[PDB]
């Protein structure tokens, strides 16, 4: 759809369980593990996939492709190996707190840590 002038949208759900599936095929080939027994090329796994989601110019049709991956953290750990390899790729974040979901605020969006860099200039002037 992107190369033929249409707009698409894709939700990967989730990229955490992909990287525990690439870990299994790597260690079953006897490859040297790294941090958290992961292989050395986990960054090649998620960068070569999320680089395709782009917007072509008007001479190429004018379509687009938006991505929205999902990462699951273990007890608020936003300083682990996998949730930092994907923060350093995507153009922003949306944080969901497990201790605002218990207090009755839903959707529990952490407004302090949620940022979107490039998408701020493209919104409605009414909004």
């Amino acid at each position: 759809f992107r190369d033929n002038g249409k707009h698409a949208l894709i939700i990967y759900d989730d990229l955490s369980k992909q990287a525990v599936a690439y870990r299994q095929m790597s260690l079953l080939l006897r490859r040297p593990p790294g941090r958290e027994a992961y292989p050395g090329d986990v960054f090649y796994l998620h960068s070569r996939l999320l680089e395709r989601a782009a917007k072509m110019n008007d001479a190429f049709g004018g379509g687009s492709l938006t991505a929205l991956p999902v990462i699951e953290t273990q007890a608020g750990d936003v300083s682990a190996y996998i949730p930092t390899n994907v923060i350093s790729i995507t153009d922003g974040q949306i944080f969901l707190e497990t201790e605002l979901f218990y207090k009755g605020i839903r959707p529990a969006i952490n407004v302090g840590l949620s940022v979107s860099r490039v998408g701020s200039a493209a919104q409605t002037r009414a909004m």
């Binding site: 006897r30 040297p32 958290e36 027994a37 750990d77």
Partner: protein, 54 residues
């Protein structure tokens, strides 16, 4: 009056010194548990790499 004013503020100021010491005691429990797993993981790789190169 002054021994009642003092003995009530000893009740409050010893209460916030146990909330702040229990708020601090959960944040070091997660870091203890990340680091406990990371040492079993690290010294497991050294045995495997020592046997594979042999």
């Amino acid at each position: 009056e002054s021994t009642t004013s003092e003995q009530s503020a000893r009740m409050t100021a010893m209460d916030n010194a146990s909330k702040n010491a229990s708020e601090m005691i959960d944040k070091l429990t997660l870091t203890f548990n990340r680091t406990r797993q990371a040492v079993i993981t690290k010294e497991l790789i050294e045995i495997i790499s020592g046997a594979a190169a042999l």
